[PDB]
Symmetry: C3
Subunit: 123 residues, 3 copies
Amino acid sequence: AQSRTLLAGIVQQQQQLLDVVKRQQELLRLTVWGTKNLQTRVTAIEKYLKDQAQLNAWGAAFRQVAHTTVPWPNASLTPKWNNETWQEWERKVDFLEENITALLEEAQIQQEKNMYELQKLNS
Amino acid sequence: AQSRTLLAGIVQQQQQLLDVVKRQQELLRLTVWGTKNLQTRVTAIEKYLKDQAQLNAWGAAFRQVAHTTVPWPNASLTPKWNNETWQEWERKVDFLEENITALLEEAQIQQEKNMYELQKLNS
Amino acid sequence: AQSRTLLAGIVQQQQQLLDVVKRQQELLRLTVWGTKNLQTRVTAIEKYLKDQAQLNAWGAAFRQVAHTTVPWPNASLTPKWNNETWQEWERKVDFLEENITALLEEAQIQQEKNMYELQKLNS
């Protein structure tokens, strides 16, 4: 009189939900890559912006033996606020990812044990 | 003859899935911070780009009492399309976050009630 | 003697978890839009950076009939590495999204069948 068939569907449904949850984590990693890739491009752009400061006046002297170079800062380089804040941001993600793996690992073990118990009822 | 042990595992498994789901929301917030932080840096870069337009020709005159300044636009500032579209983007997230909290709140209450019912069977 | 009420809560709880999971996918799409929108702005900024290279020296000649134009590259345009890598990044998301829809579709069908079975016990 036990509803094993209903439980098999419920137990199976939990597995499908677990897979989508794990799948979301993989998708999240791809999004993180896009953001980080933009930062690498940003580092190159600031370097180029500095070159623009070097460009000031070409041939601005035809009766003098001197050239005026005005390399005024262009890209504001972040020394501590972004690096310290970004490292903390990445670190929070690292602890959160480790926590999700722990719950997924226990869920996988528990998931197999729950199904095994169902078999024991009518093994 | 009831499979309370199997149900305890199934009920417990749902709680573990709920935690990972809530955990994903926290991780998502960290990703949003990285994107928003880049925008703050972008606002500073456009300001610097405007300064580059000001740089045009230094000392390009040694027999005249005048200086040619050509501050031609450099960074295209967004007045309505990004602000109106970005506000809508943030607003959609705000309604979605509120909807997730409602489902999590009901799940927590329902989760405790489901376990309490299991205790009533053999309390 | 069956715990249908407990199962109804467990079955209902799974539906609530499924909704939040689907809700996370919608939220993820909004985050992807923010990242892609920044790239469109970046494409415009590189074009503006090229214009800065054109600006070199205005009026740097008052006794000559010539102008010195030095349009040295400014923004490093990505021809193959970002496009090929970004297309692969978007493609991975496309396969992952299709996989999530398949699991959600099966879960919806299975979810309705699990509830229908509960009704059959006492229909």
